[PDB]
Amino acid sequence: NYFPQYPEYAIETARLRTFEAWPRNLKQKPHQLAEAGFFYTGVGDRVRCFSCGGGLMDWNDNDEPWEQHALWLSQCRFVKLMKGQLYIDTVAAKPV
Ligand SMILES: [Zn+2]
Numbered sequence: 001n002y003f004p005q006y007p008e009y010a011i012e013t014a015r016l017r018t019f020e021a022w023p024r025n026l027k028q029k030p031h032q033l034a035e036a037g038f039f040y041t042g043v044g045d046r047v048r049c050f051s052c053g054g055g056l057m058d059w060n061d062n063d064e065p066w067e068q069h070a071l072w073l074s075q076c077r078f079v080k081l082m083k084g085q086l087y088i089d090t091v092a093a094k095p096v
Helices: 012-021 030-035 065-072 077-082 085-093
Strands: 038-040 047-049
Touching (some): 012 038, 030 065, 065 085
Antiparallel strands (some): 038 047
């Protein structure tokens, strides 16, 4: 059924605040990861989505939150409602 997997982190602001210990040297800044529906696990570079509860880590230089989101967590209703199913389909088709 649909409702946030982490209702407490439904609001962006609440999600942002968890990145205070986020590894500064990373390309993915907190505001980015936050907007893409992610909150910080407090450990390493691991984050989880408030809606799908999916967690992504090992963030490489070439990674964009939304895209990574769409790629691995394709069934996430937050992405579909923000980016739309086309974006998802597109990201799912992209070569690299
Ligand atoms: Zn998600």
